[PDB]
Ligand binder design. Structure first.
Ligand SMILES: [Mg+2]
Ligand SMILES: [Mg+2]
Ligand SMILES: [Mg+2]
Ligand SMILES: [Mg+2]
Ligand SMILES: [Mg+2]
Ligand SMILES: [Mg+2]
Ligand SMILES: [Mg+2]
Ligand SMILES: [Mg+2]
Ligand SMILES: [Mg+2]
Ligand SMILES: [Mg+2]
Ligand SMILES: [Mg+2]
Ligand SMILES: [Mg+2]
Ligand SMILES: [Mg+2]
Ligand SMILES: [Mg+2]
Ligand SMILES: [Mg+2]
Ligand SMILES: [Mg+2]
Ligand SMILES: [Mg+2]
Ligand SMILES: [Mg+2]
Ligand SMILES: [Mg+2]
Ligand SMILES: [Mg+2]
Ligand SMILES: [Mg+2]
Lengths: 225, 156, 212
RNA sequence: GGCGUAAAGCGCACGCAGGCGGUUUGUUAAGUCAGAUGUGAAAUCCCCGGGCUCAACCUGGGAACUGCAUCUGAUACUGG
RNA sequence: AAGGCGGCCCCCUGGACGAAGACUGACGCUCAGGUGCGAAAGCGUGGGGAGCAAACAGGAUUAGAUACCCUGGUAGUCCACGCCGUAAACGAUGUCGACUUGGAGGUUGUGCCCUUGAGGCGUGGCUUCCGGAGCUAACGCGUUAAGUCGACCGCCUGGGGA
RNA sequence: CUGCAUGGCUGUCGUCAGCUCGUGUUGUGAAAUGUUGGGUUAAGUCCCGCAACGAGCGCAACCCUUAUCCUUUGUUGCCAG
């Protein structure tokens, strides 16, 4: 689950080369191997356990969490983990102003019911095919990005960033609002705007799946009443 | 509850292909009047919209200041891009000895007696930020004792 | 000239005519002369009353003017005496006997002519044009209109150089021909010239064309 | 207060007088720090009271005159 | 040090850096006056003068063209000793000390590793680009700071008149 | 008489394709993103990428005529038999 041994065989060692490392990452990085910085599990694991404890502490009570992992390979894993844990997520390009511009994104969220009526009802029955094709194309385009947050309604309570350097836009919008973020950073990331730092690999196929499984397990164990 | 107050309104312009289009800017200061203060600089095509635009941002961008019973704790100086502010705690009855865009924000914040002085360029836009940074950077005896590791009476 | 009149561009599609009859131009000129005379007489008489519009039908050897107004009580009078009083003059002006109908208009702040009216009265009584137009557009938006656009031009506020100000809310699709774009004009005779007012009120998209 | 661009780095280098000066001990105590004495006129300002019916004005005491000289000590810093 | 320095060879000489070693023991930094060096242009003497080229001659465009263009052409550019000490003499940033995240290089030493390739791990000197914090009105500077200081010198106080 | 006080109407750029706003963000601030960049087009038409997310006036469609066929009803319009 959170044991140190499983991460070694899953692969957390190689995060990035030694020419891309962020200067304020000295303490988390143990050393350099083959001109590639290697993270240390002896400090990776306890902070991850603390983050899991603090996250299930919120999961037990009320609160919605975000699962921003918008990578080219981790999208399916994020979607599966979110569906398993019964939480919300986004699996496409992070729309700038999704949390700080909720006053306007709520209109977009509320417009995939009256606009999806073309697909679930057809109005009469697929009225005016010439514009009905445009209607269904825009419906598909609209929920392609925000299909995982259509059942939220209110503002989220906690954030989970998989790539805290690629998704600094989400962190910037979370910070000025004031919601906790349990983000996992790489050797080339900044542990400044994130509230909880989880050093280690994030762009590996197996590491992201392991982290998603762990977070899903802890969030479904905290809220199991 | 709040003590919202407009400081000044300025008229800006922007030349375009068809001509010059005007615009208005509003600067406002809000606060509960006890220990909180915030500033808002809004811009809109008209004076009535700009003032509300500034007011909303001032309301939602307030800053809490750990002031004394009626004054500020210790004399402080704030430095901004073009304005320098100096604020000294006065005695009871002196009033808000300030000028420009400082006395209004000081009265909205909650302090009642302070000697304020502006050095450099005395523009409202920069002086408001300078005088709010001066109140943000200052600390209370309890706050300084917390980092010192001793008691207020010990660090008297 | 920039914009064409939005009524006579969709009169044949979604908008109704203000005069419904037939002629073989043996009497067409005198018929419109009579229509113009009765319309101007009604406008001059019912000044205090907020008349919305005047539709005219001309059957054989008879006429029927169906005035639409917001406050019909003033025109009606006690026991319906004022209408009988003002019906004989219309009948004798038009020659053939008349039968005046009066229709109350619901939502008096959502009619183009009504919203274009009384703003001239406010300007005459020296009410600021900006606040007047803002109140008119906000009331029209609140009542249910999907789009309102108000333009006021000429010697605004008694200045030295005339200008043209305008406000707009919602959406006003002037180019489409499948929507209610009810539009009317009015003018104010102030102490320093004349002020022109134009109002466009988009209510909805009338699918199917004429006859609902 | 500033000197890259508004006014402000000598074109550069050497160097006299001058300005400053790494680290430890002992000594001196010149600057510096403490106390005391004389003086720093009266007048004037300020504080507490009084007299002019109030005030202006006058007046008693106190404080102050931020300075100087001498004496008796303190030795951390600067100075020999 | 600045100005500046470009075939090769010889003669004399200044300066900088590094591996390890011992002493001299504050001898250290800056500098008003003062001295010295100081691009090119310029002047005096005695020479040299291929090319280039102020002044000048002719042609050409243009209303005019005492210029840009073309054909020649003197001083000058060259050598030695002399004189002035002027430049956007610019990094528009006066000398030194230590402190304050990184990446990619350039040049030049030095220790050790199987030097199988300009293989790797450290450490110095000079210098280029990007950039974090910080600073600045902004541009931008950013371990060679325009970031926080310390010691010294010079200069600035509205634009013209100057 | 004053279109150098105007209302209304009209010409031009141009039937060019741009012109703006709300929220958010960036810079103290005038302001910028959105509207740029890649394909694409008759086009701010669409897509992708991107501190942008949406909307309005706009580019199109709905409107009028004509290009084929079916049906309803044949005089003053037609002659398969
Ligand atoms: Mg100054
Ligand atoms: Mg200068
Ligand atoms: Mg200049
Ligand atoms: Mg210099
Ligand atoms: Mg000189
Ligand atoms: Mg002494
Ligand atoms: Mg003494
Ligand atoms: Mg008395
Ligand atoms: Mg005295
Ligand atoms: Mg000594
Ligand atoms: Mg040598
Ligand atoms: Mg000198
Ligand atoms: Mg020369
Ligand atoms: Mg020649
Ligand atoms: Mg020549
Ligand atoms: Mg010569
Ligand atoms: Mg000079
Ligand atoms: Mg210079
Ligand atoms: Mg020197
Ligand atoms: Mg060098
Ligand atoms: Mg840089």
């Amino acid at each position: 689950t959170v044991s140190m041994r499983d991460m070694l065989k899953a692969g957390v060692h190689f995060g990035h080369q030694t020419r891309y490392w962020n200067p304020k990452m000295k303490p988390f990085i143990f050393g350099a191997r083959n001109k590639v910085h290697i993270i240390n599990l002896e400090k990776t694991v306890p902070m991850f356990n603390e983050a899991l404890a603090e996250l299930n502490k919120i999961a037990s009570r009320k609160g919605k969490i975000l699962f921003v992992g918008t990578k080219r390979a981790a999208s399916e894993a994020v979607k599966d983990a979110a569906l398993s844990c019964d939480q919300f997520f986004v699996n496409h390009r992070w729309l700038g102003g999704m949390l700080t511009n909720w006053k306007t994104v709520r209109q977009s969220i509320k417009r995939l019911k009256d606009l999806e009526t073309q697909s679930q009802d057809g109005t009469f029955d697929k009225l005016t095919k010439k514009e009905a094709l445009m209607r269904t194309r825009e419906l598909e385009k609209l929920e392609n990005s925000l299909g995982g947050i259509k059942d939220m309604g209110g503002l989220p309570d906690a954030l989970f960033v998989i790539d805290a350097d690629h998704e600094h836009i989400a962190i910037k919008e979370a910070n000025n609002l004031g919601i906790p973020v349990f983000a996992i950073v790489d050797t080339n990331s900044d542990p400044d705007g994130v509230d909880f730092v989880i050093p280690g690999n994030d762009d590996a196929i197996r590491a992201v799946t392991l982290y998603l499984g762990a977070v899903a397990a802890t969030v479904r164990e905290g809220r199991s009443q | 509850e709040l003590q919202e107050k407009l400081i000044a309104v300025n008229r800006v312009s922007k030349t375009v292909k068809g001509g010059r289009i005007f615009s208005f800017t509003a600067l406002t200061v809000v606060g509960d009047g006890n220990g909180r203060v915030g500033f808002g600089y809004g811009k809109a095509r008209e004076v009535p919209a700009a003032i509300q635009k500034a007011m909303e941002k001032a309301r939602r961008n307030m800053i809490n200041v750990a002031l004394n019973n009626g004054t500020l704790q210790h004399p402080v100086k704030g430095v901004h891009t073009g304005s320098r502010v100096f604020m000294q705690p006065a005695s009871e009855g002196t009033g808000i000895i300030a000028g420009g865009a400082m006395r209004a924000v000081l009265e909205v914040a909650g302090v009642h007696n302070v000697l304020a002085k502006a050095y450099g360029s005395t523009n409202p836009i920069n002086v408001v930020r300078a005088t709010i940074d001066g109140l943000e950077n200052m600390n209370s005896p309890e706050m300084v004792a917390a980092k010192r590791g001793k008691s207020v009476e010990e660090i008297l | 000239g920039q914009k064409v009149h939005p009524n006579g561009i969709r009169l044949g599609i979604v908008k109704p005519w203000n005069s419904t009859w037939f002629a073989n131009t043996k009497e067409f000129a005198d018929n419109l002369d009579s229509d113009f005379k009765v319309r101007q007489y009604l406008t001059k008489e019912l000044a205090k009353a907020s008349v919305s519009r005047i539709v005219i039908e001309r059957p054989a050897k008879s006429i029927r003017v169906t005035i639409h107004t917001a406050r019909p009580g003033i025109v009606i009078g006690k026991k319906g005496e004022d209408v009988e009083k003002l019906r004989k003059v219309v009948a004798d002006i038009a020659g053939v006997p008349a039968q005046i109908n009066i229709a109350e208009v619901r939502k008096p702040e959502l009619d183009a002519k009504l919203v274009a009216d009384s703003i001239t009265s406010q300007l005459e009584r020296r009410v600021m044009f900006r606040r007047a137009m803002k109140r008119a557009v906000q009331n029209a938006m609140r009542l249910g209109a999907k789009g309102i656009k108000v333009e006021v031009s000429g010697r605004l506020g008694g200045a030295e150089i005339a200008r043209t100000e305008w406000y707009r809310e919602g959406r006003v699709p002037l180019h489409t021909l499948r929507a209610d774009i009810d539009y009317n004009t009015s003018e104010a005779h102030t102490t320093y010239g004349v002020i022109g007012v134009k109002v466009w009120i988009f209510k909805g998209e009338i699918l199917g064309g004429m006859a609902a």
